């Protein structure tokens with residue numbers, strides 16, 4: 001029941017207490033864990049991934065009711081051996097995502113250090129999945145702006161809570177791409193692109209999202225909801241921003257747009273956004289001198305968007321094109 005190598009990992013059936021020792025995952029290998037229902041998996045060392053040509057994920061764990069106890073250990077992706085400023089858009093191959101977590105349970109207190117590109121992919125789930133006290137430290141990717149597409153958490157899943165986490169990166173802190181009942185609470189995001197829903201693609205539906213109690217600093221955006229201009233059979237419905245403290249924003253405090261990859265222009269109509277609120281505790285957002293406070297670019301949006309608890313200051317005014325939705329502010333114009 002102690003995993004000391006990629007080959008030991010296949011031999012954990014029957015264990016309710018698995019110890020994951022530190023080792024290197026060699027080039028051309030992946031680390032896959034399929035623990036018994038309800039097993040506790042405890043990390044006892046750091047796992048380093050040698051430079052590899054494989055596609056990600058390089059680590060996959062899938063189980064039901066897993067209790068993952070990180071004990072502050074590290075999954076080291078050696079990202080600086082890949083980073084070239086182009087991420088997964090072009091350039092060198094980037095194994096991505098680095099980690100994949102599927103099923104259900106509670107994952108606590110480990111660090112992903114220097115992912116090649118996107119760090120932690122979440123989903124699908126079979127019951128509630130909680131990620132608590134995880135650090136994605138891709139800060140080294142800031143040097144010469146070489147880190148790219150270093151998303152902290154990419155979520156396509158139902159019934160997820162991500163709380164008490166820290167992300168230092170160059171792209172979305174979280175990107176919620178599909179699923180219902182997703183909570184992102186009491187996290188700290190810096191360096192990247194803020195807290196995102198999307199990009200929403202054809203056939204994807206995000207609903208019942210709570211973004212509460214987070215701090216965002218030194219980022220390109222505060223919060224974003226992005227849908228591909230071309231997406232159809234898609235939606236975002238029921239989003240609540242509550243008690244977020246955001247500052248140091250370079251481009252947009254809030255950008256809600258159906259023009260992606262463009263910020264504005266000819267917004268799409270096939271990925272309707274509805275019921276987007278800033279309520280509960282104040283969400284305060286301070287933007288830089290050249291930044292825009294709030295832009296909403298809707299081709300198809302609906303509902304009574306209560307933005308009473310939003311305050312955005314700094315920078316310049318954006319534009320509001322909310323389609324059928326009625327936005328009741330708040331201070332940001």
Ligand SMILES: *[C@@H]1O[C@H](CO)[C@@H](O)[C@H](O)[C@H]1NC(C)=O
Pocket residue numbers: 089090091
């Ligand atoms: C990748 O970069 C090359 C230029 O070096 C360009 O010709 C190609 O079309 C680019 N592709 C993407 C997908 O960005």
Ligand SMILES: *[C@@H]1O[C@H](CO)[C@@H](O)[C@H](O)[C@H]1NC(C)=O
Pocket residue numbers: 126127128158159180181
């Ligand atoms: C998981 O989400 C699915 C769809 O949201 C819902 O039907 C189900 O009740 C949720 N399960 C749990 C355990 O929350």
Ligand SMILES: [Cl-]
Pocket residue numbers: 027028029051052053054
């Ligand atoms: Cl290889």
